[PDB]
PDB file of all heavy atoms in Angstrom:
ATOM      1  N   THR A   6      16.326 -48.882-121.233  1.00  0.00           N
ATOM      2  CA  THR A   6      16.658 -48.501-119.833  1.00  0.00           C
ATOM      3  C   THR A   6      18.147 -48.840-119.626  1.00  0.00           C
ATOM      4  O   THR A   6      18.731 -49.637-120.373  1.00  0.00           O
ATOM      5  CB  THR A   6      15.756 -49.093-118.810  1.00  0.00           C
ATOM      6  OG1 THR A   6      15.790 -50.566-118.966  1.00  0.00           O
ATOM      7  CG2 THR A   6      14.330 -48.635-118.998  1.00  0.00           C
ATOM      8  N   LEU A  57      43.203 -80.005-132.131  1.00  0.00           N
ATOM      9  CA  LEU A  57      43.444 -81.437-132.510  1.00  0.00           C
ATOM     10  C   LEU A  57      44.270 -82.162-131.445  1.00  0.00           C
ATOM     11  O   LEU A  57      43.932 -83.281-131.117  1.00  0.00           O
ATOM     12  CB  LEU A  57      44.141 -81.463-133.875  1.00  0.00           C
ATOM     13  CG  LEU A  57      44.521 -82.875-134.403  1.00  0.00           C
ATOM     14  CD1 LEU A  57      43.319 -83.798-134.398  1.00  0.00           C
ATOM     15  CD2 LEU A  57      45.080 -82.731-135.840  1.00  0.00           C
ATOM     16  N   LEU A  76      31.699 -89.599-126.724  1.00  0.00           N
ATOM     17  CA  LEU A  76      32.936 -90.272-127.321  1.00  0.00           C
ATOM     18  C   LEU A  76      32.857 -90.294-128.815  1.00  0.00           C
ATOM     19  O   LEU A  76      33.874 -89.909-129.477  1.00  0.00           O
ATOM     20  CB  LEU A  76      33.118 -91.704-126.763  1.00  0.00           C
ATOM     21  CG  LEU A  76      34.348 -92.394-127.189  1.00  0.00           C
ATOM     22  CD1 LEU A  76      35.620 -91.540-126.837  1.00  0.00           C
ATOM     23  CD2 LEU A  76      34.456 -93.772-126.484  1.00  0.00           C
ATOM     24  N   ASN A  80      35.400 -88.759-131.667  1.00  0.00           N
ATOM     25  CA  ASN A  80      36.052 -89.474-132.796  1.00  0.00           C
ATOM     26  C   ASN A  80      35.781 -88.783-134.077  1.00  0.00           C
ATOM     27  O   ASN A  80      36.682 -88.663-134.936  1.00  0.00           O
ATOM     28  CB  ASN A  80      35.532 -90.959-132.760  1.00  0.00           C
ATOM     29  CG  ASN A  80      36.015 -91.705-131.550  1.00  0.00           C
ATOM     30  OD1 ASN A  80      37.197 -92.031-131.398  1.00  0.00           O
ATOM     31  ND2 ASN A  80      35.119 -92.265-130.739  1.00  0.00           N
TER      32      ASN A  80
END
Side-chain angles (χ1 to χ4, degrees):
Chain A
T6 58
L57 178 53
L76 186 52
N80 292 295

